[PDB]
Amino acid sequence: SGFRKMAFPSGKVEGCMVQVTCGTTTLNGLWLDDVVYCPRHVICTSEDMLNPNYEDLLIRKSNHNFLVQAGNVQLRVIGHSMQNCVLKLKVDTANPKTPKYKFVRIQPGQTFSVLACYNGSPSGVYQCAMRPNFTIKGSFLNGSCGSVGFNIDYDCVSFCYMHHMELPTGVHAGTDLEGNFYGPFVDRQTAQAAGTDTTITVNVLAWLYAAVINGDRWFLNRFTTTLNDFNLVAMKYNYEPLTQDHVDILGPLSAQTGIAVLDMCASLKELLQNGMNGRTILGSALLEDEFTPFDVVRQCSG
């Protein structure tokens, strides 16, 4: 309590959303400088989506087959190519609202804001976490493909996700802005299973640090652990093992509280092995795993 999922302001990304139509298939695209990025399955008929031959489908296409619109204003396409599972449509106008940006590929556990779009028009913005099985729990309906996920650092938009599909379990899958899927998924209208999901350990630790920052520290014990010993125990409770990068991104919170990362790991290990015992942390018996160390600092320190 005192914490909520907070998205980044969406305006810089709103200014880049367009619609891309092939035939009657419409989805969203991202217009940066003179290129529009979108999922390559825009070129598919519904009957092609079963087992599309994207390469053969693309050679039958010409620039004049792609309808790109910002609102009702057509953007003329002057070139096209495919990079992994994304289509890059060169257009004759550089987007005057292009922010400073980069394309980043995120790691599981990292959070990002999603600007859910339909027909090139934004509907809503919300925060998502990349699960360890490389799915996200989005709120995506038909026509949402091409909606993007992003973080904003200073003036710079880091695009990290483009939406492509839904799985039998109702979670969602997609690519980075270079078209490489997160996880083992493919853009075919076939049934695909996500791996068993696990709890995001690094984010649980961030949450415990947040509890400590707010004076809730009953769970701190007098012991420590090695990273390997912690990782082996953690996996028995369906928690992700920590990476070295996880240890490093906890550094600022460790410094803020003076609690070594591996000491917090020992406290978490005791919570896993011994349970909560009816106690709460930040007002809950459940450990939250969708706040990153960066999210915690934003809401504790501003």
Interacting residues toward a copy of itself by CB under 8 A: 1-12, 14-15, 115-116, 118, 122-126, 128, 137-139, 141-143, 170, 214-215, 280, 283-286, 298-299, 301-302
User: Looking at this protein, which amino acid is placed at residue 299?
Assistant: Q
Nearer to a copy of itself among residue 115 and residue 261 (C-beta): 115
175 touches, from a copy of itself, ligand YMG, none (C-beta below 5 to 8 Å by class): none
N- to C-terminal Cα separation, the chain: 17
126 touches, from a copy of itself, ligand YMG, none (C-beta below 5 to 8 Å by class): a copy of itself
Nearer to a copy of itself among residue 60 and residue 278 (C-beta): 278
Known catalytic membership, residue 128: no
For residue 145, which of 168, 169, 170, 114 has the smallest C-alpha distance?
A: 114
102 touches, from ligand YMG, a copy of itself, none (C-beta below 5 to 8 Å by class): none
Q: Which of 145, 163, 172, 246 is catalytic?
A: 145
114 strand-pairing partners: 126, 149
- Rg value, the chain, Cα: 22
Residue with the two structure tokens 């999210």: 295
Q: How many C-alpha atoms does 296 have within 13 Å on its Cβ side?
A: 29
Q: Which of 16, 22, 41, 117 is catalytic?
A: 41
Report the nearest approach of a copy of itself to the CB of residue 111 (Å): 12
Nearer to ligand YMG among residue 40 and residue 269 (C-beta): 40
- The CA distances from residue 185 to 195, 201, 220, in Å, are 11, 24, 40
For residue 263, which of 252, 274, 254 has the smallest C-alpha distance?
A: 254
Nearer to ligand YMG among residue 78 and residue 141 (C-beta): 141
CA distance linking residue 288 with residue 204, whole number of Å: 6
Report the nearest approach of ligand YMG to the CB of residue 136 (Å): 10
The catalytic residue positions are 41, 145
